[PDB]
Amino acid sequence: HTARLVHTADLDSETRQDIRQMVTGAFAGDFTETDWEHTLGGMHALIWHHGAIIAHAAVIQRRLIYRGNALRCGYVEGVAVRADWRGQRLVSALLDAVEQVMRGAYQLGALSSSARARRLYASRGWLPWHGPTSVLAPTGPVRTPDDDGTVFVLPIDISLDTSAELMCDWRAGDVW
Amino acid sequence: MHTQVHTARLVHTADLDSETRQDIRQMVTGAFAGDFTETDWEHTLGGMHALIWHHGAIIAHAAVIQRRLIYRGNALRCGYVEGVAVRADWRGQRLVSALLDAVEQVMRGAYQLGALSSSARARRLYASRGWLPWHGPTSVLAPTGPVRTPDDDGTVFVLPIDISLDTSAELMCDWRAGDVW
Ligand SMILES: CC(C)(COP(=O)(O)OP(=O)(O)OC[C@H]1O[C@@H](n2cnc3c(N)ncnc32)[C@H](O)[C@@H]1OP(=O)(O)O)[C@@H](O)C(=O)NCCC(=O)NCCS
Ligand SMILES: CC(C)(COP(=O)(O)OP(=O)(O)OC[C@H]1O[C@@H](n2cnc3c(N)ncnc32)[C@H](O)[C@@H]1OP(=O)(O)O)[C@@H](O)C(=O)NCCC(=O)NCCS
Ligand SMILES: NC[C@H]1O[C@H](O[C@H]2[C@H](O)[C@@H](O[C@H]3O[C@H](CO)[C@@H](O)[C@H](N)[C@H]3O)[C@H](N)C[C@@H]2N)[C@H](N)C[C@@H]1O
Ligand SMILES: NC[C@H]1O[C@H](O[C@H]2[C@H](O)[C@@H](O[C@H]3O[C@H](CO)[C@@H](O)[C@H](N)[C@H]3O)[C@H](N)C[C@@H]2N)[C@H](N)C[C@@H]1O
Numbered sequence A: 001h002t003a004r005l006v007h008t009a010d011l012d013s014e015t016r017q018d019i020r021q022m023v024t025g026a027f028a029g030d031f032t033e034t035d036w037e038h039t040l041g042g043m044h045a046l047i048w049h050h051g052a053i054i055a056h057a058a059v060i061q062r063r064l065i066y067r068g069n070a071l072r073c074g075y076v077e078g079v080a081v082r083a084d085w086r087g088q089r090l091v092s093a094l095l096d097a098v099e100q101v102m103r104g105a106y107q108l109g110a111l112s113s114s115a116r117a118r119r120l121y122a123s124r125g126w127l128p129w130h131g132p133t134s135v136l137a138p139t140g141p142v143r144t145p146d147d148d149g150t151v152f153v154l155p156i157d158i159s160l161d162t163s164a165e166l167m168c169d170w171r172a173g174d175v176w
Numbered sequence B: 001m002h003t004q005v006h007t008a009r010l011v012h013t014a015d016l017d018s019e020t021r022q023d024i025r026q027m028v029t030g031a032f033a034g035d036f037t038e039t040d041w042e043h044t045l046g047g048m049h050a051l052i053w054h055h056g057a058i059i060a061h062a063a064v065i066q067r068r069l070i071y072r073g074n075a076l077r078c079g080y081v082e083g084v085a086v087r088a089d090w091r092g093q094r095l096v097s098a099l100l101d102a103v104e105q106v107m108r109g110a111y112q113l114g115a116l117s118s119s120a121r122a123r124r125l126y127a128s129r130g131w132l133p134w135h136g137p138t139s140v141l142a143p144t145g146p147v148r149t150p151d152d153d154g155t156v157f158v159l160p161i162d163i164s165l166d167t168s169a170e171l172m173c174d175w176r177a178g179d180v181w
């Protein structure tokens, strides 16, 4: 299988719904209205089999502040492979597409991973963040300790001290 | 299907081949008569470029990049318009309208609102298409906290997509290097 990249604005309404339902079912309900909102706005890597969406990952644009610079970041959201199609390395095909988008448009990729998926990201060259994570909330920088240990980055055109602070920009729901 | 002549084509930054990317950058930089910095170029990257081609050259460009604008404590998902330019030999023919057809389509299909900071020259063009001028004070959520951006007051326009915005309220953009708006 090979993923196809489609911008959110190019999704017909039937396709957009098929994605939301497949991703929601793949997370077994652990995917909220704001998790879905966070998957919108960027490029969706999609894998189909006979007219049905069997795999999805989205890369959206945001800023991550590292050593005072607001790095242009491709943030990965909604990675999911339909349950009956798992164990077939379809996720590797989704990540090939999302990583291609990073190399062509961003300074680094980033994402917040489940304890499970960590081996997968690390095997592809993603780096686990060791420094304290924070978010630039409307009141100012606030640490995000519940997200520590879950963030991974994919440097594109920068070497990174992964034990320095990393502060994402603000949004509703999970900020990472 | 007709030839598609002068219809703007949408291409993500990651899909621009090297020659096209350089053509866009020199064209947009030259369209602005020296008021387009390296940082302003960086701001045009990461999203969808609306491109109009003529004889293999880019004669108009507008990019829609994604960011958040904070309104009443809500981080709205915004398509922000950067690098709007029509090459000078092609101006006066409404090609910017063709760019905006594409930009507005991206807003309706992917964001809660479009926004941009307009030149005094271009304000009427946007207002004519239904973009609303932002009358409230503007600010940016800088690393030290909110800070007003008075130099950007009276320049911002928005295109709400099925959300109602009180355009007299404070509007606070997220942080980046260079001009935040
Ligand atoms: C995480 C996920 C995207 C991986 O997709 P995938 O294509 O199945 O991944 P792979 O084929 O490379 O397999 C990954 C691991 O999943 C497990 N797995 C294998 N078969 C499985 C099956 N039939 N059903 C469920 N999990 C299975 C194994 O641990 C496997 O390790 P291995 O490849 O070294 O043997 C997928 O399990 C899924 O969508 N999970 C729920 C959503 C979620 O957690 N997404 C990740 C968010 S960061
Ligand atoms: C703003 C811009 C994109 C408009 O593009 P366009 O396709 O030429 O727009 P229009 O055809 O609607 O012309 C806009 C106005 O420019 C003027 N104009 C006409 N011919 C012109 C020319 N040859 N050169 C300069 N301005 C001209 C007229 O005032 C016209 O208004 P009208 O339609 O009411 O007569 C273009 O002038 C530009 O690239 N300027 C430099 C970059 C810039 O400032 N971008 C704006 C980003 S906010
Ligand atoms: N809930 C659905 C989401 O799950 C993941 O991210 C989320 C991570 O899974 C979250 O991680 C949390 O849940 C995981 C997985 O159960 C735990 O391993 C982890 N220690 C805990 O902090 C982290 N705290 C936030 C992040 N948005 C996907 N990357 C995106 C998806 O929207
Ligand atoms: N300099 C190149 C840029 O010009 C425009 O935006 C810029 C606006 O033109 C700027 O507006 C300023 O410049 C214009 C003159 O062009 C004045 O009308 C306005 N009062 C003044 O504040 C505003 N302050 C910042 C914004 N990024 C383009 N939309 C984007 C482009 O990168």
Ligand SMILES: Nc1ncnc2c1ncn2[C@@H]1O[C@H](COP(=O)(O)OP(=O)(O)O)[C@@H](OP(=O)(O)O)[C@H]1O
Binding pocket: B054, B055, B089, B090
């Ligand atoms: N209305 C326009 N304003 C500005 N340039 C224009 C316009 N109409 C035609 N041109 C250009 O003026 C040149 C001559 O136009 P044509 O290509 O139509 O010429 P031709 O029919 O005689 O072969 C072309 O530019 P190029 O040679 O650098 O590619 C063409 O793009």
